[PDB]
Ligand binder design. Structure first.
Ligand SMILES: Cc1cc2nc3c(=O)[nH]c(=O)nc-3n(C[C@H](O)[C@H](O)[C@H](O)COP(=O)(O)O)c2cc1C
Ligand SMILES: Cc1cc2nc3c(=O)[nH]c(=O)nc-3n(C[C@H](O)[C@H](O)[C@H](O)COP(=O)(O)O)c2cc1C
Lengths: 309, 313
């Protein structure tokens, strides 16, 4: 009849839904909750080789702002991949975001045998937007290329990159031109949060998060049109790669638009932070309802088929 | 005993509010309606040396939380807005800004040369648009710092008066610092408007499975509530890094509280785009009353008492 299945990266995902990196994925107990949910997959917290002040998160009327910075260290998440994750349940992604090309490369050499033995999939975070002193790596195309070449030399398996939003076609073209030179980059996740927004509270006349003078990354309804644009822009310019959509998903109708724009998988951040892992039962049901009303039987029938006018 | 007055640029503004460039300001009838409204000021549509019809329609679309547009600088031509500044605008009612958006530094400098005598006699104030995010082929000038420096040097040579610049949003501190370092080298840049729309978003209709505006494959500039936290961040980022310039806030203003936050972040004037497109010029009566109500509840008597005073917890 109808299916939400996604056959990519040598895996059959039950549906396109997973958590966004950093949400519900830092403790063993959250990973278990994610693994136990009806999501098609899950991803770990972006980790650093070794293990920001609070409040570092804040629920907004239209979404969220965050200045998280915090992880249990690479060894923990590599261990969770090694012999703690139930792969018969769903595939697993691990997010890494070392502070240099060398840290990332070192971490990948370590991951290589786990990935080969267990099937865990690397997502390299080039876009993280609260790193004090270090702007988004992918906003500096010379640094982008150096990271991607370093990882490609150190890592034998395919991997993905999590990208910041871009806001004009020259940057979309330049980024896609670089990514298209690295065959091991098999997927691109669009988008990380929109960086360095600022939220102020009317009553207290104060910023709502402590680090970085209140500047933090935006998620949720604020970022949805930007996320769709980036998904579609890279879908069009990187036809040899998969696009994962991330940003602004609250309903199956939101997920439908991400897929229409080009998304293979659909990550859920702010809405999952608010709803918990039961959201995935609602999203799959809502996605299927939209498809039923349109007569679609599989995602491959409309992925990327947004009609221009 | 409370006041919304703003004393900047040699004028007294009755209040901080004005239209955002491009909204309700393209024809004489719209400019007259802005002048008759209670806004403290107004600004013309960004103009080119010649008249332009702009991008094919539909090119504007109302979103749940704001708007998307790819207008493409439809405008009556510089000569029209110059004549409005010189001969029709009632300066006893309120000050006037003229926005210009030539396609090259030389286009902009020729327009400024003709504007200069009108600015000297009548007092119209120039806003240079470096951020227009829908001109097919031409990317946001202020996203290329070499072009930005070139445009500013060209206008500084051509134009004798202080002027302002309308800026695209930035999203990291390296870019905030690069832009502010350039701006601080041009003494004639006296105000900075943050922000123009967030460029090249994309909206798709679920029912039709197609983009909602025609140009550029449906990609267009976002306005309205989507952009509010980004707009506040840009206002405060430049407020901090350009202490010798005024900051004008633009983006996401639908209420007097939204305007209060802009001023708290450092805005001297507050521009209103999407919300004004939807409500019309009566919005300014509501915004002033709402802003006065926020200040009454806090004991503020003037905007100088809290402008820029956001507390970093
Ligand atoms: C609290 C929080 C923590 C996050 N941590 C990470 C992270 O560690 N690595 C990463 O690549 N993205 C991180 N993100 C960004 C999300 O993965 C996602 O890109 C963003 O929130 C937009 O999705 P949304 O609109 O569904 O929230 C984080 C987001 C939030 C709100
Ligand atoms: C229909 C429309 C036309 C616009 N035209 C211009 C323009 O000609 N020049 C300019 O600098 N900005 C233009 N803008 C951008 C607005 O001035 C403003 O920066 C943006 O809409 C964000 O403000 P808002 O959230 O209040 O809408 C236009 C915006 C819209 C929606």
């Amino acid at each position: 009849s109808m299916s939400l299945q996604v056959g990519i990266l040598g895996n059959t995902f039950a549906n396109p839904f997973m958590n966004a990196a950093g949400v519900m994925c830092s403790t063993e107990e959250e990973l278990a909750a994610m693994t136990e949910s009806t999501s098609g997959s899950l991803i770990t917290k972006s980790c650093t080789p070794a293990l920001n002040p609070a409040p570092r998160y804040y629920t907004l009327p239209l979404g969220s702002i965050n200045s998280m910075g915090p992880n249990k260290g690479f060894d923990f998440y590599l261990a969770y991949s090694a012999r703690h994750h139930d792969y018969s349940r769903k595939p697993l992604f691990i997010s890494i975001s070392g502070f240099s090309a060398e840290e990332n490369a070192e971490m990948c050499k370590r991951l290589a045998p786990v990935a080969a033995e267990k099937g865990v999939i690397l997502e390299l975070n080039l876009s993280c937007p609260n790193v004090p002193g270090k702007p988004q790596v992918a906003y500096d195309f010379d640094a982008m290329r150096r990271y991607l070449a370093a990882i490609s030399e150190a890592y034998p398996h395919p991997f993905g990159v999590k990208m910041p939003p871009y806001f004009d076609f020259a940057h979309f073209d330049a980024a896609a031109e670089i990514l298209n030179q690295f065959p091991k980059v098999q997927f691109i996740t669009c988008i990380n949060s929109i960086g360095n927004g600022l939220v102020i509270d009317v009553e207290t006349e104060s910023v709502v998060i402590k680090p970085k003078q209140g500047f933090g990354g935006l998620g949720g309804r604020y970022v949805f049109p930007t996320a769709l644009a980036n998904v579609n822009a890279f879908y069009r310019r990187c036809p040899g790669k998969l696009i994962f959509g991330c940003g602004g998903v609250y309903t199956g109708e939101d997920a439908f638009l991400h897929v229409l724009a080009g998304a293979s998988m659909v990550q859920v951040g702010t809405a999952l932070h608010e709803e918990g892992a039961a959201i995935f039962e609602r999203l799959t049901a809502e996605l299927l309802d939209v498809m039923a009303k349109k007569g679609y039987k599989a995602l491959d029938e409309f992925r990327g088929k947004v009609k221009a006018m």
